[PDB]
């Protein structure tokens, strides 16, 4: 998965 603010 990928998460970015």
Number of beta strands: 0
| Structural class by SSE content | little secondary structure
Distance between the termini: 14 Å
Gyration radius, in Å: 5 Å
Coarse shape: rod-shaped
Helicity, as a percent range: under 10%
Quickly count the helices: 0
Largest sheet: none
The fraction of residues assigned to DSSP E strands is under 5%
Task: Please provide a written account of the structure.
By secondary structure, the protein is largely without helices or strands. The protein has no helices and no strands. The protein is rod-shaped. The PDB classes it as protein fibril.
Write a brief caption for the model.
It has no helix or strand. The protein is largely without helices or strands and 5 residues long.
Write the layout of secondary structure elements.
Blueprint: no helix or strand
List keywords for this structure.
1 chain of a larger assembly, 5 residues, little secondary structure, 0% helix, 0% strand, protein fibril, Rippled beta sheet, amyloid fibril, Racemic mixture of amylin segment 25-AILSS-29
